Ligand binder design. Structure first.
Ligand SMILES: Cc1ncc(C[n+]2csc(CCOP(=O)(O)OP(=O)(O)O)c2C)c(N)n1
Ligand SMILES: Cc1ncc(C[n+]2csc(CCOP(=O)(O)OP(=O)(O)O)c2C)c(N)n1
Ligand SMILES: [K+]
Ligand SMILES: [K+]
Ligand SMILES: [Mg+2]
Ligand SMILES: [Mg+2]
Lengths: 330, 362, 330, 362
């Protein structure tokens, strides 16, 4: 029905949840008067004021703990990390205070909070600002982790994240913020919700299953378009949720294609691709495999600055296509 | 025929950036004296019993006793309302009791039985109650949380305040300072309390802190130093701090000077960094319970005979609780995965291997 | 002969390195006058003094950063965390200031530092004190991660770690500290070194390959003894190194046994076992696998306190044997 | 003709826990003036050049400019020895030059070519030099590191000091406070320097810090507030702080009041939180290069013509350096995995898929 960027889809989602529940509020660095470090929270402060949209000093561990404390007391905070690279300073609050609390209290203390912000590689930001944390957070029980790709995912997931009564980590992508997508009337509604824990097939296929999350989903689609002209039909699956991941949709697809390839932007060892492959080998889809599952990921090195080096540290369409042809042996 | 109440003089608090501090005189009624006595006595006997149960292997893991710091938990409670909020570290068996949990519930949780306040899921360091948020094992982590709870108090506009406690050892944690800045910046009704019992586990304060004046570490935040062995000093300073925060003046730092008779934990004798004679001297001259006793008798607020009667009832109560906790069955294995997520439909949780599945209900 | 506990072995290693190089020093909470939170550094302060053995206040992020600084300045600090659960507050210093520096600086600034301390499950310490961080650290390039089991491992690995010129994370186990093992004359030498990156076959076998690290290795040997009486011979492999792991040794074993089972004490998703199963699938041994690999791990929940619950949250010998019979259909 | 030296008056520093501070009068020789002028000018032209290259997309990602803050890096270098140590955040182009790196190596790193000081591996934020440890991208992370470098100075008994710089925004990081405590506890020769340019990215000091007296945040640690636009004031305060540390008295805090003409980075126009008139007012009233120039011309330490000739030489040096940085080739793809580990035999590293392998040498 119309064109809307991921940035605007996320802004829409937060706006609607802020209007819907007075207990919801946003806090983070430059989130208010500056309109957000990446302009995602633009216009919010001007509309809701100092009480709902709160600018904070540069104290990650500090304001993350404050957000968690406010959640234990009944409020529903949205804690923004300028980038998740900076969440490492506050990771103890996320893991030991937010995630395990409901379990430790025997079901007496819930923690309705959302941690969001850009995750993974960007462009020329170097080693300390390009890390992907999908695997780290997805490793912890009591936490829900989502990684949206397009505008529809972004809006639907942030709203569900806000409504869930448990801690939810929303790993966004800075490179996706300005990308426009066709926003149907159903997504424009204030009742639009995307359930946590359900994958999505972005492209139907019969020859091979390609699974990914976040920005690389777009690269898988382009790869699928190229292979298509060659007669190869890929089934592209957008994970959406890292934890709890929807293995049923992935396995169902594998039982049809007999081939599997995973694509992620993070480091390979102990990454998202490893977990998928292990789940496949332990489940009922293993016997439907006609070739070993292969993983496409970022290079196993900290992110280099130089352009030509950076391009070879992130998976490209050609890497995806090459891995697919290897699996299909064509 | 005893006095309905009496007036007592208390030591003046040291002040940091405060024009005036709490009063130097306070009125104690008979009804309150008797109450505080039973409370401190209960906490004392409960800890000694916990100690005994630990040596017998009934309690596992960590078990930090607040033995000797009774005037703090009882005194703090005496100065706040039940609708106010509190959060502390792992040495909070007394706080869980003063916040409303029964000795039975507390001991049963320590012995890991289904009758524990957490069904045996948390243990000695993790116990919650109404407006009591633990019970936190990561040193310093509870301070930002407390500031968050204070934020919520301000946000809700119900005039409630939040008391956030941390030890002298925890006083050197960086996040505490981030919390001071934000609490002052936003004038949060947060009462930062430093329980100074002279030791951060095995490290004395002089070896861990360049400055040992904890009530001033807040720098731009006002503070006061209190005698943490005199329940009436704690109650009066607490009532003052709370009024300061309810008036909308922002956070305030309160340092309670106390002492712990036992070691850091059950696995620490607590005699390799301090002498037994020091422990004995403090106990002999400033025990919180004896101080209140000698105060009520001398002022004819109560008789030594009546206090002895309370001690008998308390001992009886603790003995029954210990029996319950030692005989209460362990929680069923079928509930291992319960309460991972709140408000979610049930689901399966993986065990030691893929063929072991546990149900998980909110 | 000589029988020495893991705790004693580690103490010997550090003591020998302290004497060998005066730039080596130990820092952490209660390591000096207290003789160590778990007594691993007992006697060190008495022999070397306040300059070489430094008690620090409770400031994780602080002294970890101080340690990295000292290493950058030419010293060889051994930074001890009372437990790795507390390393989360300083994980940023470990990953962004230590691990990536050599690469970002183009090879100009090395960071010879060691981070050690007990990792994983203990006995009744509850959720915030039982987390295993093997998967988290082993995921980061620029870092070396080791996980010793017995006395030989402990001594040899700590000495190699100290002599390495890059950040090394040594994940010890509290329950193993008091366990005694026979200490051969070789290990008794001050020259005893275990190369980082090589696994060790603790038991020769022909029917199945069982890979593990840390404490559960003892459980695997226990399971292997029970199974041998039934005619099943397990080849037990002690990884020793998480990053870079010795996949070559694991593959050679699978190519002989055709079966694989991984055993770890941490959470299942994105864990160590997942990476091993993904490597086997992408490697040359995949065609030699006659049954899918299975993973034995800790339950997917935060550590409960009650004894019976904790017993079922950690892998027991029975769970290992069960998994092994399922893989061999016996 | 030209005076060989001249005396100038410098603003008195505000003190915290210091009986006396640096002198309010200093002598500048003609030889030093010429050196300082050329240095500040080079930093200034290099930053304006970086700005141009960034707009042309030659430079990518982050690129924080320090124009307006030149009196800080040059004044700091003037007050210490080459054997002393320094570490700062990401706004370090000036420091990399004052510490010994050529304009060529610096611009080549910004443009990501093989000739960069890091060979295109780190970019704008990660540059190292002799006794210069970055060049750190995580706010506040460099402070505990500086304390660690200072610890090593004491440990090796070399009598050298370490300058640890951080901005006003970073002054609210908890790790900075854990560092103050340890440095004071062990009396480390650490000079904590807060570069206060009034803004933490887009947030002014008053909205981020409950207390804006950065030189007193150290509490128990002594401090002084200095005029960061006056090269001579900075040099004097630095010589004073350095001597303080070398005498074994421990750490000290120095607050430099300066200003940045550009926004936080190349992606921030820097006008949504401050006016264009404010920026120009600081420039016309206190541009550090203008101030030094007027001083030298008035005192006849140098002629307006000589300073003009120096500007011409600097401009040509910058231009020739930019030519080299835009013509220099990128690092070869074959060295992508280089320098992951130090002193290790060669090994292979995985690329985007399992069929892509990169060699890694130390
Ligand atoms: C972040 C962190 N670091 C270290 C520890 C280990 N630890 C547990 S209690 C303790 C002593 C804390 O002393 P203090 O704050 O004075 O409180 P007390 O026990 O004396 O009440 C330490 C170092 C921890 N739990 N968390
Ligand atoms: C831990 C962390 N949190 C957030 C950021 C994002 N960030 C980069 S620069 C910056 C502003 C720092 O301001 P300041 O310390 O005053 O220095 P200036 O840029 O003004 O020199 C922020 C918030 C970061 N780099 N690291
Ligand atoms: K939520
Ligand atoms: K090392
Ligand atoms: Mg203490
Ligand atoms: Mg600033």
């Amino acid at each position: 029905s119309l064109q809307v960027t991921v940035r605007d889809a996320i802004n829409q989602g937060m706006d609607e949840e802020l209007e819907r529940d007075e207990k919801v509020f946003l806090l983070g660095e430059e989130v208010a008067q500056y309109d957000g470090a990446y302009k995602v929270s633009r216009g919010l402060w001007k509309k809701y004021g100092d009480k709902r949209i709160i600018d904070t000093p540069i104290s990650e561990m500090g304001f993350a703990g404050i957000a968690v404390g406010a959640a234990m007391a009944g409020l529903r905070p949205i804690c923004e990390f300028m980038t998740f690279n900076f969440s490492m300073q506050a990771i103890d609050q996320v893991i030991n205070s937010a995630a395990k609390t409901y379990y430790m209290s025997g079901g007496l203390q819930p923690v309705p909070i959302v941690f969001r912000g850009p995750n993974g590689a960007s462009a020329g930001v170097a080693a300390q600002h390009s890390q992907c944390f999908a695997a780290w957070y997805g490793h912890c029980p009591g936490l829900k982790v989502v990684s949206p790709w397009n505008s529809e995912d972004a809006k639907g997931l942030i709203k569900s994240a806000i409504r869930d009564n448990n801690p939810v980590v929303v790993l966004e992508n800075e490179l996706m913020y300005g990308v426009p997508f066709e926003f149907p009337p159903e997504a424009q509604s204030k009742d639009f919700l995307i359930p946590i824990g359900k994958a999505k097939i972005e492209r139907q296929g019969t020859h091979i299953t390609v699974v990914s999350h976040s920005r690389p989903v777009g690269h898988c689609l382009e790869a699928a378009a190229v292979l298509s002209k060659e007669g190869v039909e890929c089934e592209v699956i957008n994970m959406r949720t890292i934890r709890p991941m929807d293995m049923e949709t992935i396995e169902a697809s594998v039982m049809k294609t007999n081939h599997l390839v995973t694509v992620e932007g993070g480091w390979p060892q102990f990454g998202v691709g490893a977990e998928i492959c292990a789940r496949i080998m332990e489940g009922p889809a293993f016997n439907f495999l006609d070739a070993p599952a292969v993983r496409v990921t970022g290079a196993d090195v900290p992110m280099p600055y130089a352009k030509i080096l950076e391009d070879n540290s992130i998976p490209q369409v050609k890497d995806i296509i090459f891995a697919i042809k290897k699996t299909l042996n064509i | 025929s005893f006095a309905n109440d009496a007036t007592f003089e208390i030591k003046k608090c040291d002040l940091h950036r405060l024009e005036e501090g709490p009063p130097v005189t306070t009125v104690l009624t008979r009804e309150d004296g008797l109450k505080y006595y039973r409370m401190m006595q209960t906490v004392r006997r409960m800890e000694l019993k916990a100690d005994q149960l630990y040596k017998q292997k009934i309690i596992r893991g960590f078990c930090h006793l607040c033995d000797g710091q009774e005037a703090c938990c009882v005194g703090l409670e005496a100065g706040i309302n039940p609708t106010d909020h509190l959060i502390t570290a792992y040495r909070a068996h007394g706080f869980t009791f003063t916040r409303g949990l029964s000795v039975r519930e507390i001991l049963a949780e320590l012995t890991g039985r289904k009758g524990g306040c957490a069904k045996g899921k948390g243990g000695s360091m993790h116990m919650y109650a109404k407006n009591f948020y633990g019970g936190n094992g990561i040193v310093g982590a509870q301070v930002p949380l407390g500031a968050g709870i204070a934020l919520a108090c301000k946000y809700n506009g119900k005039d409630e305040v939040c008391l956030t406690l941390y030890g002298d050892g925890a006083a050197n944690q960086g996040q505490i300072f981030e919390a001071y800045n934000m609490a002052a910046l936003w004038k949060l009704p947060c009462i930062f309390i430093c329980e100074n019992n002279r030791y951060g586990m095995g490290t004395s304060v002089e070896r861990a802190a360049a400055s040992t004046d904890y009530y001033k570490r807040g720098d731009f935040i006002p503070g006061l130093r209190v005698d943490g062995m005199d329940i009436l000093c704690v109650r009066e300073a607490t009532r003052f701090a709370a009024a300061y925060c309810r008036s909308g003046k922002g956070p305030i730092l309160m340092e309670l000077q106390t002492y712990r008779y036992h070691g850091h934990s059950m696995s620490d004798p607590g005699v390799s960094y301090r002498t037994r004679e020091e422990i004995q001297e403090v106990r002999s001259k400033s025990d919180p319970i004896m101080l209140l006793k000698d105060r009520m008798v001398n002022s004819n607020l109560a008789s030594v005979e009546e206090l002895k009667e309370i001690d008998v009832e308390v001992r009886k109560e603790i003995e029954d609780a210990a029996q319950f906790a030692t005989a209460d069955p362990e929680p069923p294995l079928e509930e291992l995965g319960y309460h991972i997520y709140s408000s979610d439909p049930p689901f399966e949780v993986r065990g030691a291997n893929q063929w072991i599945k546990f149900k998980s209900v909110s």
